Each structure stands twice: as structure tokens, then as C-alpha cells.
């Protein structure tokens, strides 16, 4: 189904961990409204968010962006301030690789559910009870969203691969994201300066 | 040991390069776009090869030499996470599915029509030939495959986990502790013994 | 446990600017170069201390938390556990490094005139200058035997330097307690409505 | 005395060709290691750890000592500018070598006898994995490092924190090693140009 995954989509300084929080929790209430994601394991559905939190985040803010110019919203954070707090590759990288290709093929929100429910249904995880089963829920996903592409855009045959193949760009920079620690130092970077100036 | 693994590298370079220009259009793009790819490309286009290799063999993978490695040799070379990972994500889903060498073919000239590599004087060109490529392995798959509807979305789906080994070969340094490591050893001993 | 562990960072975060304020002339340097020296040094400083915390410990370090070097290496990270111990808290333990020497050389990381964006680098070579002078002096006094304590001293900055990078790029800290915290907490968010 | 650490420092097919480079390379490093009192004296197995601990930081070095002698560049004979460093995609670690290392040792006229002895620490490093007699590697550090203060008290006896600035320049060695590895600095320095030379058999 594919009206459920666009329904699901538009449905003290270290206390930065407050706010992950929250950011992880609308993760998990949108995992949620997936369909059959709830009828997975519980261990399964744990490793599942532990695998796909990082793609699934970046995937939801590079989409958001669409509507700015050298900036992601999250609020709004421009590249220059993204390139003084060390990370400025990586900005680049999620500008170039993900928000303009979005932008340039007008990328609806059914069509980021259904990549964020591929993502999110990644049998490659490692401890996954049944794998067989994540795969075949992944399946359905794209399955639908072949299904979609081809009647709302059927001018356009190519749509479907493009969409699929903007998943190994997501995926490098989620590692690179890890590596850098990019979300933690985006919005811990200047409440941290900000506290450490009380040695004033 | 160590001579054979630097010819055996030139050769595979040159390999891939009279491979690429065999590419329809490829050898049409800008020198230095051409350049930009292939040095973009060479780790996941030398993984996804060896990989699809190795479906003729057990807990294990070919390279291209003849040089059968097996995972209990990875593991004590400090690898074995990465070879695990060859093995589970690549190996064994090609093995499940029989991708055959067309499919192959066409993901590694995917691959190589990377956009996304950084200097490209001309990506958009880069992405039409990528999309002409695609294109063409579904109009394979459809019709050599018409029973399985979804080939083509699983061939695009194993591209995520070839860019992730792809990084992870890079960073641990996958091939030169697999096969140089004793060599190196050896090479430093001939070094400290001679005059 | 989540709540705890950031609690926790916070509070340590506070103990290292009160400490840094302490150390004489720090407070003198432009507040933009305070603020470098800290971010630059945070990561080394908490090895510095935990190591030789875990002087009085086998197989393991203190944080109150005793994490024993079975579990690291059972959370993947084994490797930079056993670095932590054979490059720093055994040489700490086998040396006997007192908590002066720990306290000056601490003070030498935070005095890094390596760090980035530093206004004016040659102030802080200056106080690092003053801070190793003085640990000589300490070392030829009190271990006055030990002719060589001082650059031994000296020499288990590179090990505190590499460590240091390696606890970054592995989440060293995060996966040795942030591990079931981390199922409990998802699984917390599955089971709410 | 430290007169041996100062005597030791002033003694087609493109992945093979930076093979042979670093081949080379290597060797200079084994030889020069070989005239390192004592070094030699050490189980073979030890000697070969020494020096697969100790490569990169020793390799970087020679070549930031070498380059006190040249702007915004390093010499390996080949001088590499900085400009070729930032397209070869390792600005980054180059710039570091040219601020935390080359300008340092210029800054404060690190002789060749000193980078000797720091050399010889760093290659006498008791924290190489697998030594079988560690404590054996300890006490050769040990002898260079306070010959080298001895070295330092006389010929910079005006200079009396000297010693423990040389010996404070070993931690931005270590970061700068460990980030020269996982960028692959070397061989792309010099296996940048000969692979595009190569791949440019296009026509
Ligand atoms: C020991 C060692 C050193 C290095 C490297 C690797 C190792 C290295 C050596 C062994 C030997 C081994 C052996 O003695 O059989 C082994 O099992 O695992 C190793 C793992 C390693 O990472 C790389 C490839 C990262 C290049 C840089 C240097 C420092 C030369």
C-alpha cells in the first residue's frame, strides 16, 4: 500500500539528548504507521531502527530542504556555519548528492515514504530474526512504489530506478554522518561554546 | 609475493580500463570525466566482479589472479568482519537470486556512470548514460525474467551494500591485509638480512 | 540509563571548566582560545583521568561505573580497551604516576598550541612551556632516582594522543554503556502508543 | 655517543613503479634503522614489529625535516607543492605537516642529531604489539632519550625547555601517522600523477 506510507510520512548543555530523543521518537511513531512493521518481532523492529535511524533522518531533512538554497532545515542551518563546525564536506555531500537531485526531479512524499520504508526494511541487518521476512516486506514497498511511479508519472519511465538509485548516496553519507558525528555537532555545536563561556 | 601482487594490480587496472572503453559512450565523455570515474569507480567495480566470482565457491572468494581466499584466512588477518559482509550482502545474495553476468555487466557500468564523482566536468552526460544503462538491464530483466516483476529493483538494491563494503574495504585496507600481510613480513625480513 | 550517562557528560563537562579555570593564567588567554584548548583537549583530558582512576582496578577502568574488559570485548570494542590498558593505565600503575604528574600533564594537553583557530598560539606554547618546566622541576625533586621520569612522562602523550582519535572514531565511550540503554530506550518509544 | 643517531640520519606498469618507490623507501628506512646502536642486537621478529610500527611516523619525519628548506611544500628528490596536495584530495593532512611539524621544526632550528634521537625513539616504540621483549625496547628508548637531553644541555644550554619541546613535537607525529594511513597519503603523493598518466592510454 502506498496511501499509508504517505499517510504515515505527513502524520544542561549534553541534554542535547532531550532533543535526540524527540528526534528518534517521531522516527519510531512513523515506523509505526508502516504497515506490518508492528507485526515484526520486537527485537527485529529495534534492529531495524538501530540500522536505517541515521539514512532515515538525513533521507526526512534533505527532503524538508527542498524549499531553501545552501541550507538544510531541520531550524534552518546555512553551509557556511555547517563548514565552521568542521563538517562542511558532508553538508556538501547531502546539497549536492540528495536535496538538489530531490529538487531537480520534484520528489513528492509518497515517493520519500516508500524510499524510507526500503530503508527502514533493510534485511541486511545484522541479528535480524527473519530476515526473509523484513526482505519480503521491502518487496511490497517498492513493488508500490513502481506501482505509483508509473501512473502518476508515466511520461517519465526512467523515475522509478532514479528514485532506488539515490540510495547508495544516502548510504555513504550515513556513514560519513557516524563518522564526523554530523547531527550531534549541528545542534550541540554552539549551545556547547555557549555553556562553556560560564568561565566568564 | 609482493612483486606478484603489484603486476597482478597493474594487470586488473588495465583489465578495467579496456573493460570501460568497450562501454558504449564511455570513451565519447571528456578524457578527465573518464579519468574521474574509474578512479571514482575501481574499488566497487573490483568488489561486485570477485563477488560474483565467488558464487562458485563455499565460505570463500576468488580474485581474478586464481587466488582462492577462504574466511577462516580473513579472520585471522583481522577481516573477517569484511569478508562476512562480502559474503552475506553481495556473495550470497547474487547466489540466491542467479544473477547472471548481463546483470552484472550492467550494475558495474552503473556504477561506473557515477554522477555523483566529484571534478566531473559534465555529470549530466554521465547521468544519461546511466539512465540509457538501466534502462536497458530492465528491458532485460523483464524479458528474460518475466516471472520475477521485482529482478530489477533487487539488482538496483544490492548498489547500497557495494557503496558501503566499497568504504569499508578502503578504510580497513581489505585487499593488502588479506594477501600482503606475511609478505610484507617476509619482504622486511630480505630487507634487515641483506647488507 | 540514557538520562543518566547524559547527566553524567554534563557534570563532567562542569568539573573540567571549573579545573581548567584553576590552572593558573588560562583564565588570562582571549575566551575564544579557552574555548579551543577545551574542545581540542576534552577527549584526551577524561582518558587522562579514567586511566589513572583504574590504577587501583584489574582488567578494567572506572568512569562509578567498573566496566571490565570481557564486556568491551564483547561490544566490539576490545582492541582500544586493551590499548587503554597496556599503553596507559598499566604504565600509570607500573611508574606509580602520582596524581601532581597526571594533574600537570593534563594541564600540558589542555595548553595545545596545535588547536585550531587559536588566536594567538604562542601565548599558549608560553604557559605549556611554564606548566612542563614545572613538572620537570617536581619529577627531579621528588623522584630525583628516576633521572628519565620526566620524558617518560612526557612519552605517554603520543599513546594518549592515538587512543584519543581511536575512542572518537569507535564511539569508545558510547558503545561500552550505551549499548542495552539504547534497545531499552527504542523499545520504550515501541510500547508507549 | 649521539654522534651514531646523526652519523645514521646523514647516510607503463604504475602500481608497480610506486611499489618499487616505496620499496625503496622502505629500505633507506631498514638501513638507516640498522645503524641505530643496538637495534640490530634485537630478536628479528622484534625488529620487523619496530619497523611496521614505526614506517609512516619515521617516513614523515624525514620528509617534514627535509622540507624546513622550502615554502608551502615538502621534498621527498621530488618537491610536491601544497596545490598538488589539495588535488590529489590530502590538503588537509598536508597542511598539518606544513603547521605542526615542518614550521615548528624551522620555528625553533631543529638540528639533524635531534630528529635522529626523536627517530630513534619513535622507532625504539615498547608499545609495538607482539615484542617479545618489550622491556629490552623501553631501555634502548630510554638510552637515546637521555642522550638526546645531554645533547640538548650542551649544545642549547641558553634553551633549557629544549628537550621537552623536541619530545612535545612526537604527539602531532602520532595524529599526523595515523591519519597519513587512513588516507593512504603516501601512495597517493606518489601514485597520484603515474596512475592518471596511465589511465590517459585512452586513444
Ligand atoms: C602490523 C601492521 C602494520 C600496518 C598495517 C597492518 C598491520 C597488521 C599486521 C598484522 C599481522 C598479523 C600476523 O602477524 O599474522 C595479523 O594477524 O594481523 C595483522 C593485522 C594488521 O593490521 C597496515 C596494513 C594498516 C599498514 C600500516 C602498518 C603500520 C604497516
Redesign the interface.
Known amino acids: 500500500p502506498v496511501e499509508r506510507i504517505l499517510e504515515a510520512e505527513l502524520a544542561?548543555?549534553?541534554?542535547?539528548?532531550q532533543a535526540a530523543?524527540k528526534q528518534?521518537?517521531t522516527l519510531?511513531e512513523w515506523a509505526?504507521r508502516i504497515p506490518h512493521f508492528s507485526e515484526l518481532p520486537?527485537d527485529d523492529?529495534?534492529i531495524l531502527?538501530?540500522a536505517g535511524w541515521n539514512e532515515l533522518l538525513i533521507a526526512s531533512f534533505s527532503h524538508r530542504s527542498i524549499a531553501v538554497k545552501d541550507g538544510i532545515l531541520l531550524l534552518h542551518v546555512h553551509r557556511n556555519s555547517a563548514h565552521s563546525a568542521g563538517v562542511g564536506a558532508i553538508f556538501d555531500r547531502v546539497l549536492?548528492?540528495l536535496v538538489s537531485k530531490m529538487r531537480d526531479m520534484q520528489m513528492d512524499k509518497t515517493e520519500l515514504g516508500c524510499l524510507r520504508a526500503?530503508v527502514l526494511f533493510n534485511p541486511?541487518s545484522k541479528g535480524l530474526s527473519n530476515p526473509a521476512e523484513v526482505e519480503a516486506l521491502?518487496?511490497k514497498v517498492?513493488?508500490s512504489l513502481?506501482a505509483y511511479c508509473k501512473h502518476k508519472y508515466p511520461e517519465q519511465?526512467?523515475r522509478?530506478?532514479?528514485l532506488?538509485?539515490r540510495?547508495?548516496?544516502?548510504?555513504?553519507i550515513?556513514?560519513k554522518c557516524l563518522?564526523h558525528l554530523f547531527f550531534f555537532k549541528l545542534i550541540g555545536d554552539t549551545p556547547?561554546?555557549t555553556?562553556?563561556?560560564?568561565?566568564?
Do not use: H, W
Open positions: 544542561p548543555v549534553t541534554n542535547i539528548c530523543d528518534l521518537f519510531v509505526k520486537l523492529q529495534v531502527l538501530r549536492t548528492e526500503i541486511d521491502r518487496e517498492y513493488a513502481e519511465p526512467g522509478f530506478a532514479k532506488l538509485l540510495l547508495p548516496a544516502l548510504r555513504s550515513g556513514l563518522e556547547i561554546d555553556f562553556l563561556m560560564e568561565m566568564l
